[PDB]
Symmetry: D2
Subunit: 313 residues, 4 copies
């Protein structure tokens, strides 16, 4: 009886005490796995972009058979977006686990070391397979679809705000009581292996007396899709509504989501989606709805079919 | 011993079973107060705008001495924004209480009737004075600064997510254990009595691979101020950052807030605000930071002084 | 249209029990509803006999109906739901519902809650998910569901693992199902039982008396659940009484007064050494339900621990 | 630089008690720190004698220092904090701190928590806010603070009314202060007491035994707090025992096992008729603290109710 082989892919700086030398910062890692590190890119998470996403997904798909699991170290600001992109595009059913740190590795009571430890525990556990892309933060295993950051600074910020966590980790053991029902990874039709770019999808915000200029600027630039961060149950300020209604009639894909941090933007409730050709995002927040819309646009431009995609993934 | 006189100002449709005839939908109101209703405007809350705000504040300031308290019925989508605008601009220290309903007045288990009842209870209670503008929803008394909507459909959606509620209502009695520390109402310098318009402030969203076109569109239109809904602790995608940095150097006021639903966007932590001339929003979310920025711009265009305003109100 | 049976255990939650279709006419559009009053008791006085009656009724009537809705007061809903979750062998939907506001109150919650419970019981997708609680537009599993606030209409939450689904306009978006075994996958069978093992609960706090625990032991209780402090720790005096009782054959489960999170095995207390069982995410009242049932099968602590790891 | 005294009640929370400035060197930049070991006990074994000792020490040493930080285990922190909140007469900051992870663990929380507690005790703005608990970058009042999760570093929350302030980079943004009276505005004075009235807690649940409650009554306890179901309701057998005890002069407080919300007076139980007291937002363990103190002044239920409405 030997240890699993886990690869750590880094996207940025170190979250505990180079990527080569993590087994020296956290020597406890040796007792759980044989670890190898690769620096895939080196960027701040706030600057995350489509090229990095494509690079990551291709790397995991290509190296899937060379390792028992993956841990990806990633900044916290856009973790939730990269996790969902990977959840839809990775075709490997071995564990893929993302992890970060809310405090810098040099600060007192840095969270990164224990988070990294727990991420490797999770990647090494056979029970973690077939659950989609996972985020491990603060002793908790979270699915890539529902996970979001709820507080600007709290070490406990990452939560699955609509449907809850998959499991909790205590003393290196995971109690899994849930798995996601929406389709992920190998069960999706999305395949990015041949793609060098993704459809252009932007996000506009709604609020009192909202300007329509952001929306117009995107339409005039020929964006493929626009996600509205609506008020309440995905409602839109009138000027924004008028702009997006005309955009949707002339070929732009329009998804109604919500600025409100929990709950679904429901179909045909507040706005007659069938009349305008809009798609309702359900529980996906604006930034995650963008991810799914970009992918849906690689397969179809028909709002009816896009809506079905939002109801399945 | 007689009952207080409470005025109900409506901004839209009825939240229980015209505004004239509310005492017939909720006859229990008669036992608590002598009620008078006025329809101030009639618009959907998603279409809320600066003109309505100015109208409301002027009406309350003008009628303050004619009544013992005010209840304003308002749609839920933008309640949080109107509440904070009033919290900063009303000069009456009698109770001003906003209320709405998450379910339509015709549906089974409509929440509006009991919410309206409780709002009048709150407006009638002497202990409610001097606490700023209040929101009463779901048996809870919430301050206009911290209150926000947390779920798209839940009757329990309104919460003061950073500092908690002021009081709870049980059987027509309020247990107040808190009052807001930030300055409000009569203690602010903001005076809208002479104003027919407010400075133009827009909001842009950050996310992976964020377009700078929304921000550029606002700058090119000559907006007075721009609020960034940043990632994490108010961070900005690089293209957005570059656009806003140049805007701030050339006279546009720029406030960093966060798309993350709780916690403060803190000063000089993630971004060197002093170098770029940016202002950090603290706990104010993007839509509320817009409210304060619009008002601050009536007094000053200097980022240092704007920052002090964000630290006091 | 499906045939749905409403079993009442107390008062009416909208506007007795065949009145319901008159109080909530909209029910006729979604199901053919029949009602029976099984008992008439306050939820605060809920007891083992009512539990046995309910489970036998459902098990016996399973073939005659397409789903069950049980009307139940809110105070102890979470206990009954878990009991039924472990003992019901019908795989048709069983849905519990109640109301936080009286049916005569302004903005009473019971009518819409009842409507949504019937919706849930009528949906094919609800089957095989265990016993469910439907409150405030949300569908919750009977194991994790608990009341979090004394008065709020939104009180019912699955505080460790989340809800199964949300209901909007009569349609349910299910994204979860419980992994722990339930209903027809458990070994527990109450069909021939007229009583259950005696299990009590003691609370821990600063300067706690051991007298409650001693009282239960002297009365020959079969098991004792401790509502511990933090991660299931015990006040010294209480610990000593329970350690002794475990040696003489009383089953002892460490749970926590803390409202979320697991009481984990062998972390704060050497469970193997004293013959204690750790409750996991089960709060004290739920841990009682499982221990009662466990004790119908075994008195061995290691086997009871295994049960607490599977159900 | 302010002079801050660290009073320890148990183990060390970073890397005994004069070591602290060596374990957390950054403390030297913000205060002149002195440490004293007051007792050395596990938090789960916290008791009335430790409480009396702590309050007398602070009251006696108030003039010699600019603020106090008390190091305390997490299990019962919420009880000690409320006791001190009612009995301390020093108006200088008193700040409690602990750690959810052992000081030797990876990513131990105690060092930064200790640093933030000293920061808080050193800030002028912290005075006159009552006794405070500083955990996970947040400043919480001793009345409302409770532990919400068995293991999470973020467990401590003021679940009904929220935190007072948040700490970022050594600065505190205070937006709240507690309205209920505390510290030097209470009538409670423990300076001449060597013991406290005897108050125990019983739990309610389905089929609850009255034996715990009877045991406390037979031992002549001065008061009993009920952890009720829902809005402080009681299982029938328990109710009957407590109704009898209240008539013979035992003080009885109805609280709730439900983790948030008030137990409200005369709503679910006719408190006036039975001579019971409703706890408001005080959970059972906190309601014990107040009832113990109330009973040093009066045995009359109407006066005890007034106390529960003011403190």
């Amino acid at each position: 009886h030997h240890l699993p082989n886990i690869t750590i892919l880094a996207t940025g700086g170190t979250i505990a005490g180079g990527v080569e030398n993590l087994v020296n910062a956290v020597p406890q890692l040796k007792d759980i796995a044989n670890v190898k590190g690769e620096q895939v890119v080196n960027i701040g998470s706030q600057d995350m972009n489509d090229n990095v996403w494509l690079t990551l997904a291709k790397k995991i798909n290509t190296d899937c058979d060379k390792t028992d699991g993956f841990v990806i170290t990633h900044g916290t600001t856009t973790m939730e977006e990269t996790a969902y992109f990977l959840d839809l595009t990775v075709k490997c059913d071995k564990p893929v686990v993302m992890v970060g740190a809310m405090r810098p590795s040099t600060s007192m009571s840095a969270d990164g070391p224990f988070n990294l430890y727990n991420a490797v525990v999770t990647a090494a556990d056979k029970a973690s397979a077939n659950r989609g892309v996972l985020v491990v933060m603060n002793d908790t295993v979270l699915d890539g679809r529902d996970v979001t950051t709820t507080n600007t600074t709290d070490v406990a910020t990452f939560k699955s705000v609509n449907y809850g966590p998959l499991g909790y980790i205590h003393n290196g053991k995971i109690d899994y009581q849930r798995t996601p029902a929406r389709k992920h990874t190998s069960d999706t039709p999305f395949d990015v292996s041949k793609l060098n770019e993704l459809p252009k999808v932007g996000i506009v915000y709604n609020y009192a007396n909202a300007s329509d200029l952001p929306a117009k600027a995107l339409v005039d630039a020929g964006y493929d899709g626009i996600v509205s961060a609506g008020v309440g149950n995905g409602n839109l300020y009138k000027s924004v509504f008028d702009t997006l209604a005309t955009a949707a009639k002339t070929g732009t894909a329009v998804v109604r989501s919500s600025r409100v941090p929990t709950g679904a933007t429901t179909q045909d409730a507040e706005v007659d989606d069938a009349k305008y050709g809009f798609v309702a995002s359900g529980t996906l927040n604006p930034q995650k709805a963008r991810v799914l819309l970009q992918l849906a646009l690689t397969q179809t431009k028909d709002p009816q079919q896009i809506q079905q995609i939002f109801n399945q993934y």
